[PDB]
Amino acid sequence: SKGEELFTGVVPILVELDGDVNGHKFSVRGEGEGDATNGKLTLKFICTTGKLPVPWPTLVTTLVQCFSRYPDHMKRHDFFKSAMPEGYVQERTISFKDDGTYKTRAEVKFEGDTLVNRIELKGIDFKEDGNILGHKLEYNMGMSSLKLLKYVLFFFNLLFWICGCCILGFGIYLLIHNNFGVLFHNLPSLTLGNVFVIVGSIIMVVAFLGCMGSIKENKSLLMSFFILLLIILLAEVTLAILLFVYEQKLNEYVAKGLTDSIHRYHSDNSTKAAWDSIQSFLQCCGIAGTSDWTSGPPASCPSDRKVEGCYAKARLWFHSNFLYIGIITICVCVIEVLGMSFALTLNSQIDKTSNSHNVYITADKQKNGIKANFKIRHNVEDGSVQLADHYQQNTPIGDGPVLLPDNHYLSTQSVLSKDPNEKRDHMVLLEFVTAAGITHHHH
Ligand SMILES: CCCCCCCC/C=C\CCCCCCCC(=O)OC[C@H](O)CO
Ligand SMILES: *[C@@H]1O[C@H](CO)[C@@H](O)[C@H](O)[C@H]1NC(C)=O
Structure with a gap:
């Protein structure tokens, strides 16, 4: 041409x-x-x-x-x-x-x-x-490159986000809907509703960081998601070992707290509501029995012969089911560390040549x-x-x-x-x- x-x-x-x-x-x-x-x-x-x-x-x-x-x-x-x-x-x-x-x-x-x-x-x-x-x-x-972790993280964290929303919602319901008093007048924050709200809130912020970090491929959110999970995981193991090296030292501690709380029952309406709801729910009476109430057990106590103590029943329950909660503990841990491995891996395969x-x-x-x-x-x-x-x-x-x-x-x-x-x-x-x-x- x-x-x-x-x-x-x-x-x-x-x-x-x-x-x-x-x-x-x-x-x-x-x-x-x-x-x-x-x-x-x-x-x-x-x-x-x-x-x-x-x-x-x-x-x-x-x-x-x-x-x-x-x-x-x-x-x-x-x-x-x-x-x-x-x-x-x-x-x-x-x-x-x-x-x-x-x-x-x-x-x-x-x-x-x-x-x-x-x-x-x-x-x-x-x-x-x-x-x-x-x-x-x-x-x-x-x-x-197609980052398939982008979708794996987003998928699980969306589910965990919704789980947390419901856990938070039920805690919000319990704070407003029901009154179970305050067992420890010095720890007013320690209510069944607030523990739901606290754990639910933490789940949502972690799931939010996982979702936003993975789907938008934001390295800083991935690192935040990683650091926060790392911190939660570190506190978990710390409590676990700290719990068993000092089980007996903190056994006394909560026992003092319960004995201090029980002196207030006829003068503090909130601690009364706490003891009444707990005993009637767990079908127990005192810390170790009905003799803890020196003037007679309150009405919200099983009138049965040797009703078990509320604190004794609880400690027996956790000792009897230690194997179950141990399985649940390592399950949430492996989910937790898997998310850490996912996020850290996905983070490394960003901003390439x-x-x-x-x-x-x-x-x-x-x-x-x-x-x-x-x-x-x-x-x-x-x-x-x-x-x-x-x-x-x-x-x-x-x-x-x-x-x-x-x-x-x-x-x-x-x-x-x-x-x-x-x-x-x-x-x-x-x-x-x-x-x-x-x-x-x-x-
Ligand atoms: C919504 C679609 C996603 C839903 C998924 C639900 C099931 C996920 C379960 C196991 C996946 C295993 C996770 C695999 C982790 C490695 C992926 C990876 O590293 O690959 C990235 C890149 O493509 C270079 O390989
Ligand atoms: C608790 O509420 C009652 C309502 O009957 C009120 O009379 C009282 O001031 C409070 N009771 C105690 C023991 O503090």
Whole structure:
């Protein structure tokens, strides 16, 4: 082709984009150089109107496939170069999933000694707090790893979040609905409702940190989730060992607290309510029996012969069921440490280093041009991906004979950079495009 005769060397490039996305108007000017022999592009685009209202990666597809390297056996399929020097018209409809669409029209021609790309872009129906207008896309053009822990953590913590909400709710119910008094006048906080509220609240904040940290891939929330679980786990084992090295030292302590509380029963309405509800519920009477009430047991005591003591019955219950609560203890512990391992693992597989995209080319007999369609996974700040659905049509501007090709594709690789000197909003881009899809000879 005579168009490839125009592309044997490195050709200066000029790119101009005037755009409008939901009324946000902007202009981009890019300059650079195009080496079609190696399929390399080096360009530096600058936003002439201030700051770009969209993420720079969304513009790189709209921002010259005539510099694609078609290997020698595929050269007779290079429509783009054949359309030169009189150029070709490239139209596109880029549909961002669950968001707006770019609508594009562009003319690519040789103007003087330079290959020029003039584009007007109009975007409609975008979310103002979406990934596009909210600048939530990473500044790159590769695919990112799927973090399945993102979903595992979010799933369990959502369930634990709801469990905690119900535990907190039942505690809120008991604080308002029922009155079981205060067993220890000095520890007013120690009520059955408050312990529900305390444990429920702690569960919700841990589950909240796990949910928000995992689904948004926020390292700081993951570390907070880890540190908080670590602290809860450390207190648990501390209490467990501290409990058994000093069981008898704190056995006395609560026994003093109960004996102190029982002196107040005929003078403190709250401690009376505590003893009355406890005894009538557990069907017990004193600390170790009915003799603790030296003037006679209150009415809310089983009148049976040797009713067991409330404190004795409780300690016997925990000693008799130590094996069960031990199983439940290590169960909550392993769930706890599993979440720690998950979070710590997920944290390490964030912010990593860094891919190819294929533009499938198909001929259009009737408009004497080509069509193309392809999907681009833009990487979102929360780890998810934003689909950009691309449909394309290219028609030659001139009446000269152009080449209509067999189906083939272009393996594009783009590298986004930043000029450390540019104080203006900008994008330094390196691309490598090579044609493929048609194999020659016998292999
Ligand atoms: C809502 C969908 C998720 C619901 C799931 C409910 C069942 C989860 C139970 C066990 C999963 C085992 C957890 C696997 C932990 C390792 C995952 C991992 O590290 O992989 C991440 C990355 O993809 C590199 O491998
Ligand atoms: C508790 O409430 C009663 C209501 O009968 C009230 O008369 C009294 O001031 C309080 N009783 C004691 C023992 O403090």
